[PDB]
Structure 1
């Protein structure tokens, strides 16, 4: 048990991890299913032990890669996993292997997920950090203070629409 194995009982077969459960089964039942026809629970024939059918570590493989004329260092990032079943940092989308965690918050250049982004800092290396939502600024609010602009400039922006 407790592995990514292929279970084959007298009434149910498939592939899943037999983890511990907290439900309450009936002595004449054999297994249990989910709402939309998904087997997620099994029962031993003559042993008081309730086990679930946990799916193994699966998901897409997303690789953060730089340009072909800039750098060659990449990182390994799997989806919907942890850092135990697989520069190691755990995120909500999966385990990020190949990036050192930095407490300093910088500008989000490459998105990863759950507020975590990566950048290329000096020689270039992939880092893991929480993205910055903007520059901190405390407005001097008062009842008898105002800021009237005296100098101006002319800036022309460009917006592209199909």
Structure 2
């Protein structure tokens, strides 16, 4: 029973007569040593993705990597709750979030010209002067203009079955038709998508019965 993992003395298990233990999947969890009979636990070695915190190459070319969900006592080395990060220095301050990392930790590029990893701050502290007989009334206003951009329709498209799967080959088209109607059921969906792509624009813009014109 070959494989890989970390062997560990497991006195918790009993196995009075059982040779091996196993889990929900077909993966062994406990075995007994054939030479001397004790129960050993098998735990897989740690693993995880790698992420690269980096400012734009326009600014500089300094990076700091992060192994998430890795207790890197084995691997300036830091240690966070979302993994462990090497290449940036811890800072006791707190600013807005520039490059999110996780678990309330954010990274940013200072100046020193180094990379820092801090705990994000939600906003500037404020406290209203509330009182049971006090009011605040505005004396002046301001007019503001805001932009809001949102998409309406995507690009209509359509594909051909034989021309793509079996381009210019008669013996390929002579084997493709053995599968029945796997072609029309795709073109139908694509046609429906293309139709709704025009319905969207018609709904969004065509809301005037007549075309008005401004005075000269």
Q: Which has the larger radius of gyration?
A: 2
The 3-state SS of whatever aligns with 1:112 is strand
| TM-score under structure 1 length normalisation | 0.81
| SS of residue paired to 1:111 | strand
> 1:43 aligns to what?
32
Task: Report the secondary structure of 2:112's partner residue.
Answer: coil
Q: Which has the higher strand share?
A: 1
Q: Which string of whole-angstrom CA distances, capped at 9 and with x for unpartnered residues, describes residues 95-126 of structure 1?
A: 10111111111111001111101011124211
Distance 1:43 1:134, change over 3 A: farther
Note the aligned Cα RMSD (angstroms): 3.4
Asked if the contact 2:15–2:39 (Cα under 8 Å) also holds between the matched residues in 1, the reply is no
* Native 8 Å contact 1:83 1:89 kept in 2: no
Contact 1:18 1:53 in 2 (8 A): yes
Q: Report which structure shows greater RCO (CA 8 Å, sep ≥6).
A: 1
In the superposition, relative to structure 1, how do residues 31 and 75 fare at CA in structure 2: closer, same or farther (>3 Å)? same
User: Does the 8 Å contact 1:99/1:127 carry over to 2?
Assistant: yes
Using the TM superposition, give the Cα deviation of residue 92 of structure 1 relative to its aligned residue in structure 2, in angstroms. 2.2
Q: Deviation per CA, 1:67-101, whole angstroms, max 9, x where unpaired?
A: 12201111121122112021321122211011111
2:142 corresponds to which of 153, 156, 161: 153
Question: How far, CA to CA, are the matches of 2:51 and 2:127 in structure 1?
Answer: 39
Separation in 2, partners of 1:24, 1:33 = 12
Superposed, 1:3-152 pairs within 5 Å as 12-21=1-10, 23-45=12-34, 47=36, 49-152=38-141
Rounded Cα–Cα distance in structure 1 between residues aligned with 2:129 and 2:33: 69
More helix by share: 2
For the structure 1 residues 108 and 50, does the alpha-carbon distance in structure 2 shift closer, same or farther, using more than 3 Å as the test? farther
TM superposition score normalised by structure 2:
0.62
Q: 1:150 to 1:39 in 2, by over 3 A?
A: farther
Q: After TM superposition, give the deviation of residue 150 of structure 1 in Å.
A: 1.8
